[PDB]
Amino acid sequence: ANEVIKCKAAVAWEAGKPLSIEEIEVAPPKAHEVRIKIIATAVCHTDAYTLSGADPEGCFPVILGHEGAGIVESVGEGVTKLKAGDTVIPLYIPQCGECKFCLNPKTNLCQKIRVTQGKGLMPDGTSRFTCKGKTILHYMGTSTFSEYTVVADISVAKIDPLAPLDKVCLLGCGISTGYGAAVNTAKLEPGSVCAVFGLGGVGLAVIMGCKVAGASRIIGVDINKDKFARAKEFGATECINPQDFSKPIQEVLIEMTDGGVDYSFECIGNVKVMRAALEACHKGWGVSVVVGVAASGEEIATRPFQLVTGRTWKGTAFGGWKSVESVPKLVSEYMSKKIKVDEFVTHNLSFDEINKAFELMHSGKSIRTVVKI
Amino acid sequence: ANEVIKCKAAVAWEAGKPLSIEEIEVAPPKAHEVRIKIIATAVCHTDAYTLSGADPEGCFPVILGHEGAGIVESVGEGVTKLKAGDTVIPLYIPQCGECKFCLNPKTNLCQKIRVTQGKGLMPDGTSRFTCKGKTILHYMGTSTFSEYTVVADISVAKIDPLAPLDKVCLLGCGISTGYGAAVNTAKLEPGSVCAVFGLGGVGLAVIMGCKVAGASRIIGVDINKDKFARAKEFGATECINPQDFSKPIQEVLIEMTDGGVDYSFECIGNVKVMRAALEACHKGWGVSVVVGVAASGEEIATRPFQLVTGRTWKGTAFGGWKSVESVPKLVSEYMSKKIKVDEFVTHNLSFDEINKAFELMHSGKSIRTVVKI
Ligand SMILES: NC(=O)c1ccc[n+]([C@@H]2O[C@H](COP(=O)([O-])OP(=O)(O)OC[C@H]3O[C@@H](n4cnc5c(N)ncnc54)[C@H](O)[C@@H]3O)[C@@H](O)[C@H]2O)c1
Ligand SMILES: NC(=O)c1ccc[n+]([C@@H]2O[C@H](COP(=O)([O-])OP(=O)(O)OC[C@H]3O[C@@H](n4cnc5c(N)ncnc54)[C@H](O)[C@@H]3O)[C@@H](O)[C@H]2O)c1
Ligand SMILES: [K+]
Ligand SMILES: [K+]
Ligand SMILES: [Zn+2]
Ligand SMILES: [Zn+2]
Ligand SMILES: [Zn+2]
Ligand SMILES: [Zn+2]
């Protein structure tokens, strides 16, 4: 049978504090649940935001982490698609394949377990984590900051057994999102003129996608010029820093492209830049995709004239990929060398040093740091 | 040769004043211009806006009117596609067929003569209108409030010689716009659930378009319940008055459609309703099209979350129809009874009574008033 597992996990006892390396207890999988041995997990600003406690719906204590890759340790009752030994990637965006969202080809927003997941609980309404006699909450349905985690069976992507887990763990977030933003949401045509605001892992993935789609011009935008070199390696035809111009960035872009770009992607989470991104789009057919996640309460704005004259405002969640069926295919595209993953890894750390990943982010020197479990 | 024509015209000497029936002079067409005898003209909210004095780009004295139908009286040098006697409809959205916009299948916003047209002048930079020794400006490149007008040769649609002009003049604006918003901009699929905000001529045309596209549900929304009866005749499956509910209209719509509509159309020009229209759209795939023209300076807003979770914000100008090639086909759709036109006419007046159209308009008792020249 599946017995309780005692392992290590990085616990966030409270907001605004460093993660704590603790010894925790991980209950066996219940019906339709999967316990996964996490081999590698990445860290990104999403975890840091929740950690800062700025997230109104963020609760503690909790085990963060949403970019993981590992191996199925055991499955609960009724699980037949997965088995111990299967190579997998936990997904914060599940795919039950039965709800109205999963059945609609235009979205990937499965709502099957959203409510419980939002409360850091499994579908049955409880947590599988405990530490020092206290219940510890799950996070984004994945909690990859643990040697072992339990997730809903519909939050699992079975992938190629040969995939390097210390790499593909990044397909659990940034890469897949940016890439999909370009090919699924925007669906840009060959020859398209693009602008990408924010050159972090998400922006680079968008550039990668724009290149795959055959974009003619890809203009990278970031206030941190250190991001430019890698952006060009990914395919950006040129990069500009808004700080080097006195006019609003959208005016600069409009001037550089004789009217504006065909497609723009905001990968920062700044509502003022989102507006700029929209207005930087060419009249008549310009399309702007919001990828960044703005702070709660903030809102975007513009004059309706912008839309009436042809521009379209869109958004994306996890690049629009129906998670369970897409992630494996994304892993295969990486294996076949169609897309990149390795190039996103800027730093590597051991589990005990996980907190260093946060310092790296606050230094502005990282795309994606990989932490070895 | 082509002589100066002395005729009557409804002149707007100044903002905030009613139109004046004056004796004017209409110069002969210069190179690439067409002089048209206006047989019928309608009046719509656009004209009134300029007349009010609120339009920041409105100048006087000027001859308004952009919804007309007539007969070519004579053509200027270099014109071979058109000849005296041809049945036509003046277009405020031209189609030179050569510029970047005309060449692009995704837009209908020809920019060839925009500059001069915005100044109420012909392409050569001058006006063909004079009255009591003063130059009178052109309006929207059409100036249909005159027995005779002169337009750029690229601002003309040659139509079916059998079309009743006291009817098809309406295809010069409202009907074509609303209809196109549904079939060109939204391109809704059969079975779609739609919501239409504003049940005037534009909203009714949208409904007509939704019905032609095979929508399963068409929910009309207007604060004036007198608009409901005609909306249902056009195909609205039901009509609701936001004033009858205590919660935001978007919540009402979400509730009655189990998540929101597939497509919504704002046909009012109210930025608050535009937001509601966007938020009334179903998560994951909802699309909202802004058709209404908000007062300059006003802005639309919402939380990026709405877009990130799948909703798309669009706009439309003249229903996205490439004017010159489309209008004739729309007249044919009317002639073959595919679309309606007659049903939009609520009142008829003689030229001398033109000002009553504005009164009818503001009283809220009209869809479209047709003025017989
Ligand atoms: N939609 C989704 O499914 C989804 C998924 C993952 C992440 N995201 C969001 O994507 C965004 C980017 O993720 P990331 O990992 O790349 O973060 P990141 O911090 O590493 O990258 C942000 C980049 O934007 C740059 N930037 C900041 N302000 C700027 C400005 N005013 N102008 C130009 N550049 C500016 C930053 O310097 C940095 O290079 C975040 O908002 C993240 O929450 C969305
Ligand atoms: N995009 C274009 O190319 C284009 C072309 C023509 C007209 N328009 C714009 O379309 C809009 C509508 O034109 P129209 O001729 O049908 O105008 P209309 O005034 O006759 O119809 C507007 C309707 O909206 C209703 N309404 C007003 N406030 C409302 C509210 N709060 N909630 C629900 N309904 C409300 C009014 O009762 C009226 O029935 C105007 O803004 C016009 O300028 C745009
Ligand atoms: K596209
Ligand atoms: K569509
Ligand atoms: Zn991440
Ligand atoms: Zn589902
Ligand atoms: Zn009109
Ligand atoms: Zn043109």
Curated annotation (Swiss-Prot), chains A, B:
Zn(2+) 1 binds at residues 44, 66, 173. Its EC number is 1.1.1.1, 1.1.1.-, 1.1.1.284. It is an enzyme of class 1 (oxidoreductase). Its cofactor is Zn(2+). Binds 2 Zn(2+) ions per subunit. The modification N6-succinyllysine is found at residues 232, 314. It is found in: Cytoplasm. It catalyses: a primary alcohol + NAD(+) = an aldehyde + NADH + H(+); a secondary alcohol + NAD(+) = a ketone + NADH + H(+); S-(hydroxymethyl)glutathione + NADP(+) = S-formylglutathione + NADPH + H(+); S-(hydroxymethyl)glutathione + NAD(+) = S-formylglutathione + NADH + H(+). Homodimer. Catalyzes the oxidation of long-chain primary alcohols and the oxidation of S-(hydroxymethyl) glutathione. Also oxidizes long chain omega-hydroxy fatty acids, such as 20-HETE, producing both the intermediate aldehyde, 20-oxoarachidonate and the end product, a dicarboxylic acid, (5Z,8Z,11Z,14Z)-eicosatetraenedioate. Class-III ADH is remarkably ineffective in oxidizing ethanol. Required for clearance of cellular formaldehyde, a cytotoxic and carcinogenic metabolite that induces DNA damage. There are 7 different ADH's isozymes in human: three belongs to class-I: alpha, beta, and gamma, one to class-II: pi, one to class-III: chi, one to class-IV: ADH7 and one to class-V: ADH6. This is Alcohol dehydrogenase class-3. The lineage of its organism: Eukaryota, Metazoa, Chordata, Craniata, Vertebrata.
